[PDB]
PDB file of C-alpha atoms in Angstrom:
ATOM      1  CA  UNK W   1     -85.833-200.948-106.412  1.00 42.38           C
ATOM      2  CA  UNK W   2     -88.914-201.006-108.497  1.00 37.59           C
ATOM      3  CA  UNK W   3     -88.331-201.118-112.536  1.00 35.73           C
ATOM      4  CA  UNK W   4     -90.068-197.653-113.048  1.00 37.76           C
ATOM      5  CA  UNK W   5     -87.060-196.236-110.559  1.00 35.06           C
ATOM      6  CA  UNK W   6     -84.186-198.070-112.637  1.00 35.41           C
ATOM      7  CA  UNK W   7     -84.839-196.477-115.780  1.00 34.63           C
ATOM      8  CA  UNK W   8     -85.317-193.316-114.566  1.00 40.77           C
ATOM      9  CA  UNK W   9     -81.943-193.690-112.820  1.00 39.70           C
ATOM     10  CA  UNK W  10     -80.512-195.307-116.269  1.00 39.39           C
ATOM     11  CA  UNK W  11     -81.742-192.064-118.095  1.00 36.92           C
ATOM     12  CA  UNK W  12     -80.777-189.521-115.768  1.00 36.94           C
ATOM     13  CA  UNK W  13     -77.351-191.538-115.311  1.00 38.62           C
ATOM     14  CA  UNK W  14     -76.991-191.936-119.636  1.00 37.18           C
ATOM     15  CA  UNK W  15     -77.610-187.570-119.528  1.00 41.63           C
ATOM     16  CA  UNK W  16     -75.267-187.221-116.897  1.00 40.33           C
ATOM     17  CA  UNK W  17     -72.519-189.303-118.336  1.00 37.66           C
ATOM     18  CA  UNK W  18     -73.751-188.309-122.172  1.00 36.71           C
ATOM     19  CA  UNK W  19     -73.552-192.807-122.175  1.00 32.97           C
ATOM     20  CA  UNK W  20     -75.397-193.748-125.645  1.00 34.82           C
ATOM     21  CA  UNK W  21     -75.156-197.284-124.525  1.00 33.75           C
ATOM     22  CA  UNK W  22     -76.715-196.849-120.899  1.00 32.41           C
ATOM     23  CA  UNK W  23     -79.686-194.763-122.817  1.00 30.07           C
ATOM     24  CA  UNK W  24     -80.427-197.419-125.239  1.00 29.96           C
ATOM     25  CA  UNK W  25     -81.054-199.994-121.877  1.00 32.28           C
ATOM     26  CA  UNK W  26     -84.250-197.648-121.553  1.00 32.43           C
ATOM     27  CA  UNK W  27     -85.424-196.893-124.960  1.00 34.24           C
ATOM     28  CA  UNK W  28     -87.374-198.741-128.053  1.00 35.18           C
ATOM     29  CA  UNK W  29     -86.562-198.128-131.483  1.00 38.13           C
ATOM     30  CA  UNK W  30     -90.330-195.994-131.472  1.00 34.16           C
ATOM     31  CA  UNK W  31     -89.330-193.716-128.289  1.00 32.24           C
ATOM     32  CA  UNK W  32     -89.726-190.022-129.294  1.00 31.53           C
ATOM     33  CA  UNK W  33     -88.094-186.931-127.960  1.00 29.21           C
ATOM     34  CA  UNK W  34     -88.818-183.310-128.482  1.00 27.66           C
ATOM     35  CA  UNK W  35     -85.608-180.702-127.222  1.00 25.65           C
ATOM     36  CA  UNK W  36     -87.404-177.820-127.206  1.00 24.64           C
ATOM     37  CA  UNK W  37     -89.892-178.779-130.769  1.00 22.84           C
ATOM     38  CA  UNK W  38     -87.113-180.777-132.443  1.00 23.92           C
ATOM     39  CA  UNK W  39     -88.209-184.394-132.708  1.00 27.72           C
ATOM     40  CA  UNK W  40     -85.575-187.259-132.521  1.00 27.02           C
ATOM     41  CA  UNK W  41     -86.912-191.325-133.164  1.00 26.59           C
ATOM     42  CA  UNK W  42     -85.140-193.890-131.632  1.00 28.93           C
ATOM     43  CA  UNK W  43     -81.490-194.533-132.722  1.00 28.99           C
ATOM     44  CA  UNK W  44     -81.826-190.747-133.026  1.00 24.83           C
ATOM     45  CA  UNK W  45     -82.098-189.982-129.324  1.00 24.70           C
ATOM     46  CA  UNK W  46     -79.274-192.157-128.635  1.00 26.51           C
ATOM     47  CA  UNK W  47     -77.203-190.228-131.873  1.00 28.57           C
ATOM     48  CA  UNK W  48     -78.120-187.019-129.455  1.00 31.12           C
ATOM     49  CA  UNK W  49     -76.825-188.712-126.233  1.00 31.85           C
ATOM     50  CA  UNK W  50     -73.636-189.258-127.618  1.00 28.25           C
ATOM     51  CA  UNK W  51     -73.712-184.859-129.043  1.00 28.46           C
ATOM     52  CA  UNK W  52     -73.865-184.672-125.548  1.00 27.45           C
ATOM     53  CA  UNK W  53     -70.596-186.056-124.564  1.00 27.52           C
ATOM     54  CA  UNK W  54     -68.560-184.598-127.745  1.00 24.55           C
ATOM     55  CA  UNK W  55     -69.933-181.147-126.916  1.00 23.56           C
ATOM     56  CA  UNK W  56     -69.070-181.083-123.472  1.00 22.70           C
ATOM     57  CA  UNK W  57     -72.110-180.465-122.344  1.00 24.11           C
ATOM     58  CA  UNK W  58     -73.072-180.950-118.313  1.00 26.02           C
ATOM     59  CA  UNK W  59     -76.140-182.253-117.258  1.00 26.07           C
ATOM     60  CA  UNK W  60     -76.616-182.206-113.483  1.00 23.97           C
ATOM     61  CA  UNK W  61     -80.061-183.555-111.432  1.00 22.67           C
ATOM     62  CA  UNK W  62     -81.329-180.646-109.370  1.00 23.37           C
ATOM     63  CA  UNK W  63     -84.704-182.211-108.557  1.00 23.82           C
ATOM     64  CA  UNK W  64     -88.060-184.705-109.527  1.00 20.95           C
ATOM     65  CA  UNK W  65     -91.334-185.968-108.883  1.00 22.05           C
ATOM     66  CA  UNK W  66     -93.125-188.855-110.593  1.00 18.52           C
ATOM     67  CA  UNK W  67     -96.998-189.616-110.649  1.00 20.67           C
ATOM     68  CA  UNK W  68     -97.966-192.921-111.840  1.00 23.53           C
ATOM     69  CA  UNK W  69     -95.640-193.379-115.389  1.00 26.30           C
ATOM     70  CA  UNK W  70     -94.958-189.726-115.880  1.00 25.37           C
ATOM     71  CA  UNK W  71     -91.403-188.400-114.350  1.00 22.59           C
ATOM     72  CA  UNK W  72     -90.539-184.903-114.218  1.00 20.47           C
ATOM     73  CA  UNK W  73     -86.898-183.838-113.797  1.00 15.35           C
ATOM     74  CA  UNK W  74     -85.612-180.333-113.123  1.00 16.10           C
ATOM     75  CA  UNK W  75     -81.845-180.084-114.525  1.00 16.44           C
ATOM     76  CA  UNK W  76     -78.899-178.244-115.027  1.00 16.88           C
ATOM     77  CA  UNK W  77     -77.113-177.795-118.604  1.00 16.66           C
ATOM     78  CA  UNK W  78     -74.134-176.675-118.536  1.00 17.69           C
ATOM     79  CA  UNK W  79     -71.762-175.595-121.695  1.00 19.09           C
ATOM     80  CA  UNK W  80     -68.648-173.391-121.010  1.00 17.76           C
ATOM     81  CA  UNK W  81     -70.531-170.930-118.878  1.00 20.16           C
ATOM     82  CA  UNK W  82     -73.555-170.683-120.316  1.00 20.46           C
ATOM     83  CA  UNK W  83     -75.932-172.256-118.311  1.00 17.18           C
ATOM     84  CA  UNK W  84     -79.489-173.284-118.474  1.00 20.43           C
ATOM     85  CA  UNK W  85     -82.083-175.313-116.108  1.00 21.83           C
ATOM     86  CA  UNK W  86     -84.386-177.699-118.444  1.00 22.83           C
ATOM     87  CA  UNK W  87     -87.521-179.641-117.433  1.00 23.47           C
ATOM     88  CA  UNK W  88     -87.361-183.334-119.029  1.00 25.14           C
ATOM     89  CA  UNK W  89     -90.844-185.042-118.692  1.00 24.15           C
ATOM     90  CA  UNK W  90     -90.792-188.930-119.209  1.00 26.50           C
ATOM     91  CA  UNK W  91     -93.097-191.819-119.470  1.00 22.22           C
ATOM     92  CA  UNK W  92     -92.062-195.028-118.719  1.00 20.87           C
ATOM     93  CA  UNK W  93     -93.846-198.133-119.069  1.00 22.03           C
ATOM     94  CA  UNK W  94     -92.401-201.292-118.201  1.00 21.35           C
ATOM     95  CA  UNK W  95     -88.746-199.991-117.736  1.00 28.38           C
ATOM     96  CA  UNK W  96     -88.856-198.664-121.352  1.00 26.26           C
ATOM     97  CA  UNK W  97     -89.280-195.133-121.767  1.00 26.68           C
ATOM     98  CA  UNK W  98     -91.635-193.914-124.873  1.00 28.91           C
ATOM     99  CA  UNK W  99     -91.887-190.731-124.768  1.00 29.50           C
ATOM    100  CA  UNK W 100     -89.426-187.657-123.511  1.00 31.29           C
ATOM    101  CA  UNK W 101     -89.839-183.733-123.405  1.00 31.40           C
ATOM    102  CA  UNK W 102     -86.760-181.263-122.722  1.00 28.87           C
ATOM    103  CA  UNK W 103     -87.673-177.258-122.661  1.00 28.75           C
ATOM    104  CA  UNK W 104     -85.609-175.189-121.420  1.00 28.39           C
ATOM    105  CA  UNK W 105     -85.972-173.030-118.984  1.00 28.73           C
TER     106      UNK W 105
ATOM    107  CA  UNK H   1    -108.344-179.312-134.172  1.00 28.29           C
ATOM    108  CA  UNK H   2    -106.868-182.975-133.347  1.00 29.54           C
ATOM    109  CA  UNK H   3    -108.804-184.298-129.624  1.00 29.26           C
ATOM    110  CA  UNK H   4    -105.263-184.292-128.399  1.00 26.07           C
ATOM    111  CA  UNK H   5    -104.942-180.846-128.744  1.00 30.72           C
ATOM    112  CA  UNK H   6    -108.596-179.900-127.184  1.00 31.74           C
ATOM    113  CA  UNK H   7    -107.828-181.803-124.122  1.00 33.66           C
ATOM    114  CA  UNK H   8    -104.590-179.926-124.046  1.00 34.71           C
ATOM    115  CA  UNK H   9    -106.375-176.564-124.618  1.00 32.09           C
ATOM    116  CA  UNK H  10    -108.968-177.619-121.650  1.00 30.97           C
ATOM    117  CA  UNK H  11    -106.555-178.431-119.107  1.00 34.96           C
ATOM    118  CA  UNK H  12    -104.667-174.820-119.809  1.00 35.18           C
ATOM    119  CA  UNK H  13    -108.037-173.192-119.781  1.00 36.84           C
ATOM    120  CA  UNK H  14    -109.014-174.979-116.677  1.00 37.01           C
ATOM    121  CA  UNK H  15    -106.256-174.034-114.802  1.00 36.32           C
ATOM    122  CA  UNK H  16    -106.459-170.219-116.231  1.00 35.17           C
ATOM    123  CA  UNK H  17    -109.740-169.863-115.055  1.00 34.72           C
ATOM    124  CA  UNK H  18    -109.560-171.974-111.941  1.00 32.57           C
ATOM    125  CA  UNK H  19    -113.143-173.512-113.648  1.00 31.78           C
ATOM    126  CA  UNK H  20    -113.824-177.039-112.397  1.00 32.98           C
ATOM    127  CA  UNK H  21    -116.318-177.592-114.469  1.00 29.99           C
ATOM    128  CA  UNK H  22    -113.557-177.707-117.756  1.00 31.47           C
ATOM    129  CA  UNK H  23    -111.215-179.415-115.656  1.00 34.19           C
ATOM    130  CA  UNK H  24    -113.677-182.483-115.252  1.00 32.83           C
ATOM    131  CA  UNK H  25    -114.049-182.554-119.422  1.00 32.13           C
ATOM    132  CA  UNK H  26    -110.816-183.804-119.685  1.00 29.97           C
ATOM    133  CA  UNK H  27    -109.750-185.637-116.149  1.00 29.52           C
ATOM    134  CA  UNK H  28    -111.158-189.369-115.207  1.00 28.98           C
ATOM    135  CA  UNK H  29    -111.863-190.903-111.816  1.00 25.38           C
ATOM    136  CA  UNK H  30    -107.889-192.099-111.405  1.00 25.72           C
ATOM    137  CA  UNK H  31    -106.246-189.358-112.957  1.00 25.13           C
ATOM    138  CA  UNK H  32    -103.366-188.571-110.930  1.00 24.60           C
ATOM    139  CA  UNK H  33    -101.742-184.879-110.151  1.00 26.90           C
ATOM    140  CA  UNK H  34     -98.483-184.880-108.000  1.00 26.76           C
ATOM    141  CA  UNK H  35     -98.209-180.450-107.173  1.00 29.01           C
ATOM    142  CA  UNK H  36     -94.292-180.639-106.200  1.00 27.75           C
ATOM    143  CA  UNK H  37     -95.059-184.146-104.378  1.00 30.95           C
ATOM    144  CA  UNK H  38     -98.352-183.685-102.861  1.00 31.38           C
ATOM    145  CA  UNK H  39    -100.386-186.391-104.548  1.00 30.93           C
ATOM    146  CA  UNK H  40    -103.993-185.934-106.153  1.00 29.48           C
ATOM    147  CA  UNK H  41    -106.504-188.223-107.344  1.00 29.02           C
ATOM    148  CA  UNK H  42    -109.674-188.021-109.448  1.00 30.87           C
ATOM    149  CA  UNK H  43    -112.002-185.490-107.898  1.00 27.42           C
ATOM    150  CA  UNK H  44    -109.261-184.568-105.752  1.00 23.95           C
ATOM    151  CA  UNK H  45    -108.124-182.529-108.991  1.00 26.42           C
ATOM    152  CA  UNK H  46    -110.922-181.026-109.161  1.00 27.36           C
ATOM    153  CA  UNK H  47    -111.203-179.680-105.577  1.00 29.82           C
ATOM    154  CA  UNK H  48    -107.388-178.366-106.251  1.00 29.16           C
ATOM    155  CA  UNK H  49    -108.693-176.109-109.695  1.00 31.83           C
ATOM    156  CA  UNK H  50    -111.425-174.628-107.048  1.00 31.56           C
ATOM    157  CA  UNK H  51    -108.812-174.051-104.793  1.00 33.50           C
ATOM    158  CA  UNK H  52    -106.558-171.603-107.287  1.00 32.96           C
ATOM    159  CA  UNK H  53    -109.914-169.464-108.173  1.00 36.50           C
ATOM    160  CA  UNK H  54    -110.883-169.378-104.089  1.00 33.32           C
ATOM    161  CA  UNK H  55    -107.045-168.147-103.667  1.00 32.23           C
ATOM    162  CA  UNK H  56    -107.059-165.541-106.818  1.00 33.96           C
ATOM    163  CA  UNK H  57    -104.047-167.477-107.932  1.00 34.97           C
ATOM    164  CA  UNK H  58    -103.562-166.449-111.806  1.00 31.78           C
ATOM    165  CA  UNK H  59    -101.911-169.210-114.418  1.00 32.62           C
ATOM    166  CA  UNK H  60    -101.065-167.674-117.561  1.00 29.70           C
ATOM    167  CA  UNK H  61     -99.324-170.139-120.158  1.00 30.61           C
ATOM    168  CA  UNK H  62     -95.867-169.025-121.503  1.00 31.45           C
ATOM    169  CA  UNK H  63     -95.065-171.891-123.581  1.00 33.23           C
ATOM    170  CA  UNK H  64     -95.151-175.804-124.340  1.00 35.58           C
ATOM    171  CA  UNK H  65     -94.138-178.966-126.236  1.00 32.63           C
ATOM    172  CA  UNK H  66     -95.687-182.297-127.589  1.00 32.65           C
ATOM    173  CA  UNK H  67     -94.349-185.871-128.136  1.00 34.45           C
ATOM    174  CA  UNK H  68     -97.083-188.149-128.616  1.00 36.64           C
ATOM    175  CA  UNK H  69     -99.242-188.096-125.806  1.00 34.21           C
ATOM    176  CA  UNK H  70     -96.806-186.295-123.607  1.00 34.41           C
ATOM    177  CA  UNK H  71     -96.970-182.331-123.448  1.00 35.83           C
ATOM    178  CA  UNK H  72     -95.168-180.037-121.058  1.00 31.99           C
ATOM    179  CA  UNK H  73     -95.659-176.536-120.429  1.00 33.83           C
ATOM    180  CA  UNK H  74     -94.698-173.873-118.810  1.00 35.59           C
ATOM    181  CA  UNK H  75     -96.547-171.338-116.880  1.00 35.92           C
ATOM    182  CA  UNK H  76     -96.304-168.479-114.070  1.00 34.92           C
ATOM    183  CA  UNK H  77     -98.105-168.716-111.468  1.00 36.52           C
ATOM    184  CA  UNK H  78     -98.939-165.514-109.604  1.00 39.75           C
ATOM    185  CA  UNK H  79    -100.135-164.828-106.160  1.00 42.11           C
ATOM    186  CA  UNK H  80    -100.092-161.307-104.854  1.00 42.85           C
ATOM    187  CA  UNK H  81     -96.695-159.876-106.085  1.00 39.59           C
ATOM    188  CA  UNK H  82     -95.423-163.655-105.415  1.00 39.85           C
ATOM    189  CA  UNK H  83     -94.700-165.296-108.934  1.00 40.45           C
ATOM    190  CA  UNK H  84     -92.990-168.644-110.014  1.00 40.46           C
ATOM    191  CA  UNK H  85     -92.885-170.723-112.710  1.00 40.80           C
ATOM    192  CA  UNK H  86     -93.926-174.181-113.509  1.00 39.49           C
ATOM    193  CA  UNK H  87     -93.559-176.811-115.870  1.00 40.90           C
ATOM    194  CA  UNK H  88     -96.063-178.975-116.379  1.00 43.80           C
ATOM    195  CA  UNK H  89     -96.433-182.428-118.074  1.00 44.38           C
ATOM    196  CA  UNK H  90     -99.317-184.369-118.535  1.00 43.20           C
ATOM    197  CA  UNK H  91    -100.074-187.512-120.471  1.00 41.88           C
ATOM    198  CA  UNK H  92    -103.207-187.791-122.855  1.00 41.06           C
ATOM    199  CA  UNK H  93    -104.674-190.503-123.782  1.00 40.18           C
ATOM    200  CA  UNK H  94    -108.210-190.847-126.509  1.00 39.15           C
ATOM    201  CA  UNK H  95    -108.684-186.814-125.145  1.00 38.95           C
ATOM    202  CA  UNK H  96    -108.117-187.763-121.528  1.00 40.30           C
ATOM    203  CA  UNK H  97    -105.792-186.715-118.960  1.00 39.30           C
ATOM    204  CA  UNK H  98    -104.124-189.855-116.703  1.00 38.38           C
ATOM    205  CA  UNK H  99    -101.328-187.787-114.607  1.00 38.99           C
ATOM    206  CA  UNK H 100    -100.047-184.367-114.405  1.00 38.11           C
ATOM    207  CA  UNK H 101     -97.264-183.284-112.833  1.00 37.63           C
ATOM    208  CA  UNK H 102     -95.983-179.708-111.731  1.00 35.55           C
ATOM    209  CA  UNK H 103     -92.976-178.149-110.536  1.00 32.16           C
ATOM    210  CA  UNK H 104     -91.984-175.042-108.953  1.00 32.93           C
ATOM    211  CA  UNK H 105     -89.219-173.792-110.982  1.00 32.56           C
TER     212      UNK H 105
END
């Protein structure tokens, strides 16, 4: 399995099981995200992971595609019956992700 | 305006207007487009913006987000009482696009 593959499986895996310590095997202290315009840095993102988890909130993979070091995944959020689908756009260079987008949908 | 922002503005305006001719201000010979899998490259790209204006397909943009050189977007995309969305990510680098992804949502 190619490195690009692992840490999109690491990321999707750390949203799924809202696993700080699985998402910081796939960022850098300079990785950004935006969740829909608000900006997290670094130990930030992995601070949001772990919201994640206490909130109770679902994230399920419905679908992606990848071209070159961009990934685009199509999920499911899920919190107490209100439910959403969000796209979450990486980049990953050299099993490190720099960048990631989440807008729901 | 910042040049990451006029590429940005290109690329929508490209696809809104199915015009080439802006979509090759702002692509390079190995940019790479994945449409829900089907891979593009270069001037491939190109031939795929002349396909939406030969089809009367119409892209409006309904919204988007930025985190360093990633942006995502969504849009509908409207053929003939058929309509969908899409999200769309691209990376942009010194005002160039390197890969583009969209997604039927």
């Amino acid at each position: 399995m190619p490195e690009e593959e692992k840490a999109a499986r690491l990321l999707i895996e750390a949203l799924e099981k809202g696993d700080p310590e699985l998402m910081r095997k796939v960022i850098s202290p300079d990785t950004k995200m935006s969740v829909n315009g608000r900006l997290f840095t670094g130990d930030e993102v992995v601070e949001a992971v772990k919201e994640i988890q206490k909130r109770g909130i679902v994230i399920k993979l419905v679908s992606y595609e990848k071209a070159g070091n961009l990934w685009l995944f199509l999920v499911t959020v899920k919190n107490n019956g209100q439910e959403e689908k969000q796209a979450v756009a990486i980049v990953v260079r050299n099993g490190r992700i720099k960048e990631v987008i989440a807008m729901s949908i």
